[PDB]
Amino acid sequence: SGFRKMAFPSGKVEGCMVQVTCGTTTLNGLWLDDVVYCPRHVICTSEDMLNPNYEDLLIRKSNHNFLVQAGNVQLRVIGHSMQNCVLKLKVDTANPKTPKYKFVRIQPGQTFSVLACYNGSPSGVYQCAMRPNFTIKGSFLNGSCGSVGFNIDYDCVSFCYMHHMELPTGVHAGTDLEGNFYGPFVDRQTAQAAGTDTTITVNVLAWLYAAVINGDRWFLNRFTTTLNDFNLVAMKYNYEPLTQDHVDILGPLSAQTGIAVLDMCASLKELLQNGMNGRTILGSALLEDEFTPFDVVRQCSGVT
Amino acid sequence: SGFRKMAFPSGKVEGCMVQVTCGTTTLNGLWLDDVVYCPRHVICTSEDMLNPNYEDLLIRKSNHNFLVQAGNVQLRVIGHSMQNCVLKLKVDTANPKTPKYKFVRIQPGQTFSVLACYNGSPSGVYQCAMRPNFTIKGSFLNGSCGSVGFNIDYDCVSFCYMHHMELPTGVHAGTDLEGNFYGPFVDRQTAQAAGTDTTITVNVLAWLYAAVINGDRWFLNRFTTTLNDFNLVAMKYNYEPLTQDHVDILGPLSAQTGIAVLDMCASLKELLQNGMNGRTILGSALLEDEFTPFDVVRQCSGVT
């Protein structure tokens, strides 16, 4: 029992982190096989960041201008190319620690673990979610760019995020490992306001199921609702609409607890309308939405 | 910016996890050098757990009864001994992945990362704190015993916890790596009730400093207090007494923000007396106490 914001073990990803320097800028890179991936803004000076023309800035760079260091040893760069907002630095050495891996582009609501790195060295690991406004609420300081987000399935690391920037509101934006930003964000120092950060309804319901599995049952009520009635309440509270796909995804948690999805929806509806009344659920005074139904099952079953 | 419940990167500890089986019981072991540490209750059957005589049960066990498997390969046990509540299984092979390490016994209020393992395989990593009642609020299922708690200082892993059991209230109890339980808990299936789970005051203040550093400043008031006045309020709210040692430890966070410790104490006093009023601090609707002043500085500075 117990329910924690759990990250995947980060060892497989630590073995991939390198330091990339271009000019005076140092950030992190991800070394898989003989390629080092990093944000293309590594080629920018602070002045460049306001309105960068990446194709033009890249012309002034050669292989020897990208300094890649894995541990305390230097990697030889034999090629460089830009794919969307990431640079792919071809090195002459395959990473001996390359795990089985995939590059995936996640959808909002999906969670992942971040290995926050500085100077190619991992400093910490924490669990994130891709917000419905395509930002992540991370913990990143200067030098953290190139830190990655990932999920692990037994021995296969699915990289889904690469850190690029912090918006003026303190939230974070980045790309998948193909260099495409999540959301409408661009790698430029300009006014980029995030949209409504709505609550991930299916995740809140999954976490309510986790609470019931872990003995926290006070919020369970004698009511039920329909998808349409619940969604009227969800819209009012800036919650994402719940679909039949979400109900189907919650099927196994419903079976494990014996609580029909729509009954749990009615419990959530009363929690939204009445509030917590000073009470807590799984040690939280607010409704947690950064656990997917898959994370609740994985944590409550012990998948390694 | 951003503030997350961050765990240490777990790679150094993943390289130490092994599976230990004795009879029909399988749990986790920690392999450092040529020694595998694991909870001594690995020798118990379910019946034994109610009133075990560990010295007597151990007499019936020989080296070949302890099956140690690191990955998919078997380790040869050439010695076994009981140190308090842990067994030390001497193996013929030094762990090639043994990091620089220390065994430390932490005090309540101190935080650490747990690498939850099952069958010697890591499933997740999360941040914990040793509660003032000597329990931890972990996330552990059947098979998790022998999972460890640790802190990392650059390249030295300081192991501080080894998981042994779940109390009937869903909280967790375990030992340091010398086999001594934290608190009054014993490795026996009997009535063991935990004491008052008070709030770690110095940690709440550290997290309030982290909130100010990260732009969440609404709770800052125009008041100050004294250590004695604050402690009267802290006692009323089941908060740990704040000492001058805690004030000294908060010195650097006070210097960074320009907010005197006693002024932050007065802000915390008003938060206790008035509540949050539906507001949040660093995305939480309650006062977080599982970040030490050292964790706030480390996260807010980027220590790798």
Ligand SMILES: COc1ccccc1OCCNC(=O)c1cc(=O)[nH]c2ccccc12
């Ligand atoms: C406005 O900056 C950019 C815009 C577009 C693209 C890139 C931009 O920055 C690149 C460098 N950024 C960081 O190193 C950085 C990342 C972060 O998440 N938090 C910080 C907190 C304090 C200081 C710096 C950071």
Ligand SMILES: COc1ccccc1OCCNC(=O)c1cc(=O)[nH]c2ccccc12
């Ligand atoms: C009452 O048990 C013990 C008492 C003293 C000593 C050892 C005891 O157990 C040893 C085995 N325990 C586990 O594998 C276990 C640990 C845990 O934290 N959560 C669980 C959740 C469900 C089922 C089992 C567990």
